[PDB]
A and B are shown apart, each in its own frame.
Chain A
Amino acid sequence: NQYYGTGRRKSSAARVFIKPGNGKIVINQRSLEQYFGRETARMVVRQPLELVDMVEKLDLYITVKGGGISGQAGAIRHGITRALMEYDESLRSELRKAGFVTRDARQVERKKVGLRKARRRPQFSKR
Chain B
Amino acid sequence: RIRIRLKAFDHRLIDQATAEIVETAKRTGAQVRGPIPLPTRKERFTVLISPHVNKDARDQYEIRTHLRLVDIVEPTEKTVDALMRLDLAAGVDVQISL
A–B touching in complex (CB under 8 Å):
yes
Interface residues on B, range: under 10
Tell me the B9-27 residues at the A interface (CB within 8 Å). none
Q: Please tell me the size bucket of the interface on A.
A: under 10
Interchain CA distance A115-B46 in the complex, whole Å: 14
Contacts of B57 in A (CB 8 A): 113-114
Q: How many angstroms from the CA of A113 to the CA of B58 in the assembled complex?
A: 7
Residues of B contacting A113 with CB < 8 Å? Answer: 46, 56-58, 60
Hey, which chain A residues are within 8 Å of B58, CB to CB? 113-114
Point out the residues of chain B lying under 8 angstroms from A114, CB to CB: 55-58
Q: In the bound complex, what is the Cα–Cα distance between A19 and B56 (angstroms)?
A: 56
Nearest A residue to B59 via CB reads A113
Which of chain A's residues have a CB closer than 8 A to the CB of B56? 113-115
Determine the chain A residues whose CB is within 8 A of the CB of B55 once the complex forms. 114
Residues of chain A within 8 A (CB-CB) of B46 are 113
Chain A, 88-127, CB within 8 A of any chain B CB: 113-115
Shortest CB-to-CB span from B46 to chain A, Å, is 7
**Bound Cα distance from A9 to B31, whole angstroms:** 39
A114 to B58, CA, bound (A): 8
Least distance between B34 CB and chain A CB atoms (Å): 24
Interface residues of B in 28-49 (CB under 8 A from A): 46
Residue of A nearest to B48 (CB): A113
B37 to chain A, nearest CB (A): 17
Chain A residue with the shortest CB-CB distance to B49: A113
5 contacting pairs across A/B (C-beta < 8 A): A113-B60, A114-B55, A114-B56, A114-B57, A115-B56
Q: A114-B55, A114-B56 are in contact. List 6 more A-B contacts (CB 8 A).
A: A113-B46, A113-B56, A113-B57, A113-B58, A114-B57, A115-B56
